[PDB]
Design a protein around this ligand. Structure first.
Ligand code: NA
Ligand code: NA
Lengths: 180, 179, 182, 177, 177, 179
């Protein structure tokens, strides 16, 4: 032969179904990581706006759930820079539940988001990563992201300066890009 | 040269400069990649622009001639909208089309950098079209470092644009603190 | 539009002894040697220029300079006592010198405009300029700024082997609002 | 009654006192001096010193007793080398002796001294409202060069400083320094 | 050539107006008095009354005709019983009779009155820059006790109040009160 | 630690301290060359003394112990009574007989000098028996300079006394003027 077995299935996350689990995941990230550039845990109210922005913008929120429907992680994107000519560029994020790490869920979610990007005629995906976060950088390089550069000491967290490394993936889409 | 042109620094205000500023931005938008807008700004749109700067104490430093004509201005705003980026600003300088090539950009940047030191900013970031030799050379002269470039991040005038990020790290703040 | 070939860009600065003594010294001596604009015969020393700075500091006399994009002193304007007696407290005598390479560009007028603004803030009542009566360009400049011819002391000066007429031009300000004896 | 006048060459030791009293009266009572406050016995020392260092003359008129009825003097008009042939003069007559024509006699003496001292222009500075001194100067050959209006402020009012000038035939051979 | 004078004992009835004129002149024109504003006949009544009721002398110098040329007096230096043998003196000379040696004559006579009156110390308080008065006091044997720098303010400036003292052989038998 | 005399400053008033002050003063009159009176002062006279202080707004700073007893006071008055002495005061400080050599004079002097600065005083003058080395040293530590000494100006206990004058010149007033 060759404990337990866990299912992961991709779903479109909805405010009704996952607001609470998503808030929980984001807050762990806020508290114990240089991932999110928040200090204070987000509120229930804040989460409501988060969903509304993704809805208005048709930003995907792709979740991975187990057999019980418990959210194991999600991946999403939003605007990278809020100016009109950045229309074909998004910034992605992926967050895994503190109980389901080191199983490769980040990679599987990222691949599903990359497929969705191609489908949505995205040209560039940008990831902003703490420059010391070796594991995340490595995951992004495995997916074909390339180091675009690093803004030194752009962030301040846990009482110290942090470097924001940017990693980008350029897709064959859109075939026919146009000005607004 | 037969002429003199005076410049002196003033704080730009809405009631005083909204129109001159609007005309400068619209020119930048229609004619160049200095703004990643496609379509000109409305006078209405310029009300929130000013309001946002007032309520964040973002400075707007202008250069005016002997007559008080706005020759150009420089400002900054949020670089990335998350609390931990609170010491990083994104700045821009725009020079009126009749006064380009005189070194105003540099003088306005030097004043904006002094204000940045005074406002406890840690990093100023300029986002430039990576083919804009003049702007790049301005930032290099000023001591900026090329942090990186997002290739084909923008699209305007029917082509892919590379967004370059140039940064200047200051000695301030002496006492950063989480919020 | 404009260009570095069609226009000199310049800004105002407050002249200091540390930053501007040498340039100021060179501008003065040029005027001393080549014109009737200063009533000296021999060039001024560096030492003499140090006292000059001292007088203006002690008295809160402004020294307003014009500087090109590159940092070169294009010229300066200043004032001092007109006559050395207490009841002349509200009267100053001003002067403006333009660097030899930058004459004819309207620098004098800019500096004068800025100096006059400073006078209004300093509660000056009268600014007096003392000009060689043959100096058409300087007179015209003073007239365009609203100075009026107060009179002329004929053959008051002697330079380059000839008698010079000293014309006086004055500008009367609305300040001070509350003039008082000492 | 009678009264003798006789020209002398004033000095600190002999006249500082009588000169101080005349000046102080002029200061408190008129616009002939643009001082607000009386002068010292101290302040007077420098006044004489400057005269001596530059050989500026001080011509007094004294009577039988030997008392100073008045005096006339000159000094620098403008402190730059190119004004070396221009002096500024003043004449002060004691208050009891005014209206006798003393200033006229003192001035005429000072003019003669100026011719002898290679002076080219004597400038008198005068309150533009002082009809009498204006007329005296006109009688003596001075012309109204000009007036700086409201150049002074004293007794709560603006003063007009008038400049009257007398151009001499001397020096025959002026020369730059 | 000399000007004859004689000493009189001044009184309010006889000399008030002449003394007021001399003081007011000193007040307006100099620092010999630390008053700003002139005095009046009414101001004087109390001045004379204070000297009468304390038997402070007022010594006058009077010309051949009987006109007051100057006067000297003393009063309390500091108002505490322990200072009973110390007086502060002053001498004022009419403005037309200065430089004749009068303040010296008057001081000498005052000094003699002080001996006769059992005074032990005479103090003169003078502007530390009044050279002539400093010299008069030195000639008389006064020594410079010291100076209160910037003790006064007049004519828009700080004044130094110098204290000159002369110590006498009297009183032979001083006694606490 | 401590088991010491502990005290506070009060603004003395005729009502509260007339009695204690008159007693402090009489002790000094009788036993020292510090006050230049021969005889004890009357209670009637004290009322007049206070009146003057009130009339002129001359300070009377007091030092009181826990119980509430007056341990000493400092004050000032006219130095010489002529208008042009308007910016000069003569100060005095007396310490109760049982509390001397404890530093009260220094504390009271510091407090008085503060008051002089708030009051636009230019010169404080102290008149001291020239043999009073202790007081002179105290005044010197506070920045007083010896202005001079009038020999045998005083008479007390059957002997001639030298009166020393010490002055402290202040930066105030900023804009002095003739009356
Ligand atoms: Na951009
Ligand atoms: Na004058």
């Amino acid at each position: 032969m060759f404990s337990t077995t866990t299912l992961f299935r991709f779903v479109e996350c909805t405010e009704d179904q996952h607001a609470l689990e998503i808030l929980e995941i984001l807050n762990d990230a806020i508290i114990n990581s240089t991932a999110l550039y928040d200090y204070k845990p987000r509120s229930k109210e804040s989460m409501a706006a988060w969903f509304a922005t993704k809805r208005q913008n048709n930003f995907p929120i792709i979740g991975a759930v187990n057999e019980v429907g418990q959210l194991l992680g999600f991946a999403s994107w939003g605007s990278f820079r809020a100016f009109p000519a950045y229309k074909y560029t998004v910034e992605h994020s992926v967050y895994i539940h503190k109980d389901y790490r080191g199983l490769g869920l980040s990679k599987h979610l990222m691949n599903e988001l990359i497929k969705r990007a191609v489908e949505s005629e995205v040209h560039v995906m940008v990831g902003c990563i703490d420059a010391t976060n070796v594991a995340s950088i490595q995951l992004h390089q495995k997916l074909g992201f390339i180091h675009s550069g690093t803004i030194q000491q752009a962030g301040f967290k846990f009482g110290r300066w942090l470097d924001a490394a940017f990693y980008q993936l350029t897709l064959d889409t859109p075939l026919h890009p146009q000005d607004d």
